[PDB]
Amino acid sequence: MLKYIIPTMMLMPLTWLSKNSMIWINTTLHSLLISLTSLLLLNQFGDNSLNFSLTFFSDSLSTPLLILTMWLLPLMLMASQHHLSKENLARKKLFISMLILLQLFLIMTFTATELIFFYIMFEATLVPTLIIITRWGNQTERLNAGLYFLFYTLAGSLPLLVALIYIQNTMGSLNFLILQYWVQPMPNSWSNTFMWLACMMAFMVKMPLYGLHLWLPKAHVEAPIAGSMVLAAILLKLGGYGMMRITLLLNPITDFMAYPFIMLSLWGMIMTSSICLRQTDLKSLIAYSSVSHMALVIVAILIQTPWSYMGATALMIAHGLTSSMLFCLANSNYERVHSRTMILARGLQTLLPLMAAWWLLASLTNLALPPSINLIGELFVVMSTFSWSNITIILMGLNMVITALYSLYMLITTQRGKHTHHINNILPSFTRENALMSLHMLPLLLLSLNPKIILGPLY
Amino acid sequence: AFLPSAAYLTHQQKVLQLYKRALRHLESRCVHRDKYRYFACLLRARFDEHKNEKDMVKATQLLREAEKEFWHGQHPQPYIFPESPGGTSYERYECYKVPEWCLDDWHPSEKAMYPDYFAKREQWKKLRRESWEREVKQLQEETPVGGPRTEALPPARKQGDLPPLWWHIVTRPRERP
Amino acid sequence: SGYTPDEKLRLQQLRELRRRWLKDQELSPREPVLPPRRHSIFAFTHVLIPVWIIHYYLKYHVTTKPYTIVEKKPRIFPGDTILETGEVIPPMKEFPDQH
Amino acid sequence: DAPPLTLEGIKDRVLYVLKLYDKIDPEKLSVNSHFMKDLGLDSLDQVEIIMAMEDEFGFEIPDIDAEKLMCPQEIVDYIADKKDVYE
């Protein structure tokens, strides 16, 4: 993975030695070159993973997450260069260095062969994200939101540290390749009960679990646009990646430990979706929709069937692209009206027709329109949870009504109706903004032509 | 109830509004034109029977039971004009009512497609931005202390001056753009 | 009663300005000042070339693979003759004639 | 379709409806013929005249605007304002 780690590190002298008018264009160019090189991870086999070294490997789970991670950095640079145009030059370079450092932590989070190196990178991803939210967020509440984002994660994850070192002492290793072959059945006990909780609650916070999700509609709202893109597109998927690695070690106890959490997600995706019906803050509406979509990934991991893991990784990649595009659209209005209130600027299809087409496509992929990979992941999780219990389709289908209802109401409030009369600074869409929308949406629609690369280790 | 300049509804206004609503709902009930014309004269006779009532409490009571009569005998789907609220063509063209300030956002190569129109627009813009401070100082020298009582705006009390707060009434979009 | 003279004068002045605006919405005859800019071609470009492409795709890439185009076998009647073999299907029994 | 309205056409149609109304003689009538002060018409008659205007031109005048139309010229000018004539 060192062919991806060293170019990401060389982005640091690339961004600190550039000319002052050149520090966006060079980083965008070479991050796009790294994302072009990211397709060499697709050397995946039907039997074996692509095992690079003692430290790094990549199966078909980490590979779409790595391509999405290396693809999201140029899009974050495009999104975050307008509102940081008036910024000091050294602080602008520090912002770009925090995004580069976060990508550098993420690409060896997803490729960590050993689980405590996974933990170290997985918790190293806090510090650039925390600094970005609490330094380049706009409002007052970013300090409090950074505290919530920090201390839900660490309160969930410092038990995970003790649990991983306990597995290290018991099994002798935390190599995932060794633990594929040395995994022992985890019997029913209270010791193994709190073992399961210490392995799972950090990722339950990262997904987020409903009830633990309170950090998210602050940390995804009080952040700048690049922070919201990396949080909702990648950093919610560290939890699903970690669960799909760690439930190997937690059998057969998971088969009854999952029952409360599944309820917390199956009811949670009813509640949070319903919350999106009555949100005034558009960025908070996208945040509670993110909680609603990640509840399905929690259910699909906790029922641990093949169709569920395929649908869960498809839904994670699809939700990454979709929610990142939705945050970028909310920023495209917020750079014009300077308020995140959704009822403020209405009827924007009368003024921005192509941007309203981007809103339409993002909302149709949000409501899981076939044959988008949003619907592929949605539908496969629905199939596997129907095999889990035939009643859950009700809680699925009612969700699939409300998921439609907030996706179009967001379209109806922002883009339709009569426009707001007193707002007259609605500029035409810049080429940068439509470029960002197309670089979100065109990969998302091209993946419908060949979805087997985003279906994970057991396609 | 709710009016821009008046603070209430007089008894005379309530009677006229009830009379018009009763004739409209009656025309909804009485589809054919001769038959509605007959029953409209009968209802006009019913309104003319109590026209000379100088007792205001008796007249207000008759208005009240006439409203009860109306609420009983209304059509469930009354006729509504198409561009009237509740009509089938109401606020249909609001998606075509692009505001005028968006013309300030055009590219010069598409402003040069209509040179006479924008050359004629810039003098409207100049006229408005010279009229603005005159109509602000006209509003503050005519509004009473405590603010304006009603929403009624004054006309231009000089010659050459424009009426205060005139731009969005004059430059409103057409009904059929 | 109706309007007050303040309302009359204001609505008259607004009416005059509105009519001047609507007049100034008109078009000059030189406007729009534009920048300086095979009979059955529809049956060739939208029909015949797509029939060529789709027949090439079905003949040399779809039917070359098994079970991609599965046709129902043709309905066989008494008295038919098989083109591949020449086997005559024998007719039915003579009818117990009803009318 | 949809032929445009002119002030001459709106004036002719408004006076044409008022000439078809039996409480108005057609030779006394002009565009300034006030309904209560010149024609001597009732307020109920003014409401019926505005309803005949609505049934003539095919749109609804609200009552807060209907109760101020007390001459034919104000009716013609209101229809001019709500149909945007002489573009």
Binding site: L351, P428 | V98, P177 | - | -
Partner: peptide
């Protein structure tokens, strides 16, 4: 004749 201007947003960009 009597061709009227159509106010529309900037379709250039």
């Amino acid at each position: 004749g009597k061709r009227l201007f159509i106010i529309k947003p900037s379709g250039f960009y």
